[PDB]
Design a protein around this nucleic acid. Structure first.
Ligand SMILES: Nc1ncnc2c1ncn2[C@@H]1O[C@H](COP(=O)(O)OP(=O)(O)OP(=O)(O)O)[C@@H](O)[C@H]1O
Ligand SMILES: Nc1ncnc2c1ncn2[C@@H]1O[C@H](COP(=O)(O)OP(=O)(O)OP(=O)(O)O)[C@@H](O)[C@H]1O
Ligand SMILES: [Mn+2]
Ligand SMILES: [Mn+2]
Ligand SMILES: [Mn+2]
Ligand SMILES: [Mn+2]
Ligand SMILES: [Zn+2]
Ligand SMILES: [Zn+2]
Lengths: 356, 348
DNA sequence: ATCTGTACATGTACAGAT
DNA sequence: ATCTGTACATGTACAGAT
DNA sequence: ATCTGTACATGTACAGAT
DNA sequence: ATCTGTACATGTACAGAT
């Protein structure tokens, strides 16, 4: 009940969806068209809509959209970066529009993102009917973020991605453990889909900085979010409703509200909660462990699980098991203890941050 | 217990499967080769394996195989023939054939018979034509008898015909998403060439959904993991095997049952699977109850003379027009007898 | 004349609105 | 409950190119 | 336009364990 | 008797090479 009313506050309004999507699609369509001009290295690039808005778990307002501009790259050869499992160098053994980004067979990610960025910036400059500008580059982002003032503020991340149709890198062999939940045929079919590489684009001063790419499974996450049940009819017009997505929304909202107040939580991001709930859905595969009538305890058990991840410094990437998103290397112990105490506080005082 | 030991004798043998498949594959591949590489009206025909063997519900022996040679055709007007639902005339390479099914099947048939004449490493002949069958049937012996149906099919990529709009009622079982996607696949047309002497029979085709039925057979649970290595086994397929066996044994013994076929059993269990969607209603521990409710369902179909095509709901496979009342009363008696006496026919 | 990248045309699951 | 906008998968038309 | 290579589904067969 | 784990077998989707 208390959580039904939060979900009501979190629910997007069709009026807002409608106006936000009309502008967002106008801009994206025009950027996609510019990428296909004859002399553009990005000709043939294709659009893939991803992220919470297209998974139907975007909360509060429709003000942040994510879209991949993906470019098929055949004859690709990968070299894992330092056994990290998620980061790779991308080699061409064959010698191509991607000429100008090569560095002796090694494909520079920052060179290709820069040219991509400049093209977008020019196309945005020629837009005169909507108030849209290109956000200052953020280190660690693979995105070119548009800031739209459809009066209200809207963010669109244009994510540059390489598309490889070969089999997935062996670092994922043990990843995606959906056999007991969505099953082996789903897993086999999912792993026949392409995998994606986006720029790491850190400026950490480490070797190979501007040539490191990072695996992306947004496409696979979108499928899972929209086909999330062990029963084929879960949340369908002739099936039973589950509360899997509602739990994701509540958890997203807890992290959003806290991050809004506390800059101690800057290392945390919504993908951490998304990852945590993929493990909980794997742990509790049956749709009856996500009955809408048990939203309270379903939310509670996800918090307990997240808390255990924080305290034990262990949140395995769902697709790359050997990659710990909560290792010391990425997030301070003190950053994790701070969030634990804040989560424990909300959990045991009626979630006062939901009332803000 | 009794039903387990029957399923054990119905189970195909891994060696028998290997020897028959490599010979069937030899013949089918050579036939397929001739239809395009040699420039004929069917250049571009593609192979689709169908039916009980490829659905893994073949019983007793790997002695019968069904293959579609499907051919893509665009802008084919589907005029439904006098509300039958399943039968259509086809209008607008294939210049030499209204697209007459009889004229196109006969050339198809002629090509296969020439190729079979040129096969010298396998004992294989072409069965004499059966009016009413869309198949070119091959008889192989190595030395075991194997029969292969080569089914000519037209492939259309448009919306399914309107007579199917209420068909395939899987929404509460496999769901709306599975259904929407299945109906995005092509649909197929195969020859009807009866000798009933009725009106437009020569130029008619019949809808085929063997591709959809294969998917269902192999994606038959309400849970995505049913019958997978990390899910629970159900007994849906074993019930189909048991009802197929009961009919096959009854048909061998009674000529009165010549108008029944295994596709009747297949259709009835599709309705049962829809009536009883939950995998737990097909637990292996309830094999007996499950088989019995299928029997009772099949008997109610006979009693009401009503067995709708799973994809074409206005097409009654049990209409008087197709099976006499007495044939259905006869079958009701034989099934009721086997049922009420522990199935003596299963022990022979 | 035919070919074909682009974009319209069709259908419906999802979920907000009433 | 029904009505209804967006997203998206796949079929098809055709201005402009060959 | 054709065909092999790959991965893992669907099966059968059976020893050891329960 | 069933369950489990390994071996053995064929069928099928599709990437990539020719
Ligand atoms: N650190 C990351 N590692 C891997 N994939 C990520 C990461 N951050 C984001 N992604 C991918 O990019 C998508 C979009 O990122 P974003 O941060 O917008 O979150 P979201 O899932 O869309 O949710 P929200 O924007 O509502 O907070 C994610 O859904 C995920 O697929
Ligand atoms: N009357 C029919 N109407 C529609 N489709 C049919 C009909 N008869 C057969 N088929 C299709 O053709 C396939 C081959 O039919 P066939 O008679 O060989 O039986 P089967 O299902 O393969 O089983 P079995 O041969 O083991 O008895 C069927 O599985 C079905 O898809
Ligand atoms: Mn987002
Ligand atoms: Mn984003
Ligand atoms: Mn058959
Ligand atoms: Mn047959
Ligand atoms: Zn659900
Ligand atoms: Zn099953």
């Amino acid at each position: 009940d208390k959580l039904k009313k939060v979900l009501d506050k979190l629910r997007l309004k069709r009026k807002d969806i409608s106006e936000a999507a009309e502008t967002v699609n106008k801009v994206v369509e025009r950027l996609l068209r510019r990428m296909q001009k004859r002399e553009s290295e990005f000709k043939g690039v294709e659009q893939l809509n991803t992220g919470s808005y297209y998974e139907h778990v975007k909360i509060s307002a429709p003000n942040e959209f994510d879209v991949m501009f993906k470019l098929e790259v055949p004859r690709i050869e990968l070299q894992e970066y330092y056994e990290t499992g998620a980061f790779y160098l991308v080699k061409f053994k064959r010698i191509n529009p991607l000429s100008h980004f090569l560095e002796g067979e090694v494909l520079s990610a920052t060179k290709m993102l820069s040219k991509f960025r400049k093209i977008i910036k020019e196309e945005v400059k020629e837009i005169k009917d909507i108030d849209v500008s290109v956000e200052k580059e953020k280190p660690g982002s693979p995105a070119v973020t548009l800031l739209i003032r459809n009066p209200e503020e809207i963010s669109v991340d244009i994510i540059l991605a390489l598309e490889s149709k070969g089999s997935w890198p062996i670092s994922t062999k043990e990843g995606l453990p959906i056999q007991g939940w969505l099953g082996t045929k789903v897993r086999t079919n999912l792993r026949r889909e392409p995998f994606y590489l986006v720029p790491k684009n850190a400026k950490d001063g480490n070797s190979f900085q501007g040539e490191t790419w990072r695996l992306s499974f947004s496409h696979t996450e979108k499928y899972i979010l929209n086909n999330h049940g062990i029963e084929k009819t879960c949340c369908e017009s002739s099936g039973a409703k589950c509360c899997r997505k509602e739990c994701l929304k509540l958890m997203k909202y807890l992290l959003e509200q806290l991050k809004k107040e506390f800059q101690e939580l800057d290392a945390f991001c919504s993908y951490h909660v998304k990852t945590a709930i993929f493990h909980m859905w794997t742990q509790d595969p049956q749709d009856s462990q996500w009955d809408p009538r048990n939203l309270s305890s379903c939310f509670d058990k996800l918090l307990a699980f997240f808390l255990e991840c924080l305290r034990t410094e262990k949140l395995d990437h769902y697709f790359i098991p050997k990659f710990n998103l909560f290792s010391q290397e990425l997030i301070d112990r003190k950053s994790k203890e701070f969030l634990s105490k804040k989560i424990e506080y909300e959990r045991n005082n009626g979630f006062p941050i939901f009332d803000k």
